[PDB]
């Protein structure tokens with residue numbers, strides 16, 4: 001689990017969105033595994049606006065933050081899970097790192113701010129849904 005809290009937005013994995021998220025929906029995209037809902041309180045996260053390929057992510061199944069090198073956002077074939085059939089996921093970045101299904105939502109960050117959230121995994125790989133192209137997260 002986990003979310004990004006920027007401005008009056010909450011960014012979560014679409015497959016983990018709650019009823020309150022769907023009832024206060026701003027934007028969702030199943031091909032990216034992302035959903036954004038509106039919040040009453042202002043958040044403290046800032047979004048990175050860069051081309052970094054190195055950063056750090058939070059892994060809840062280890063209680064640890066790990067430094068990683070990650071690929072540029074791309075269209076990647078992801079195997080079937082409990083939440084999606086095997087399909088192509090867009091704007092996904094891959095790295096070598098530990099992940100388990102409940103690690104989705106952990107933040108990936110670089111020197112400029114939040115880059116994305118854990119969305120996929122398996123066999124020593126972790127995939128992150130990028131948010132750096134969503135420029136509207138920075139404005140009301």
Ligand SMILES: COc1ccc(C(F)(F)F)cc1CC(=O)N1CCS[C@@H](C(N)=O)C1
Nearest residue numbers: 033081083084099100101119120121122123
């Ligand atoms: C954090 O992800 C995992 C991590 C490890 C493994 C394992 F291979 F060990 F079974 C499997 C996963 C699950 C997975 O890839 N999912 C979770 C459901 S939503 C799906 C997607 N965004 O298409 C991504």
Ligand SMILES: [Zn+2]
Nearest residue numbers: 050052110112
């Ligand atoms: Zn950066």
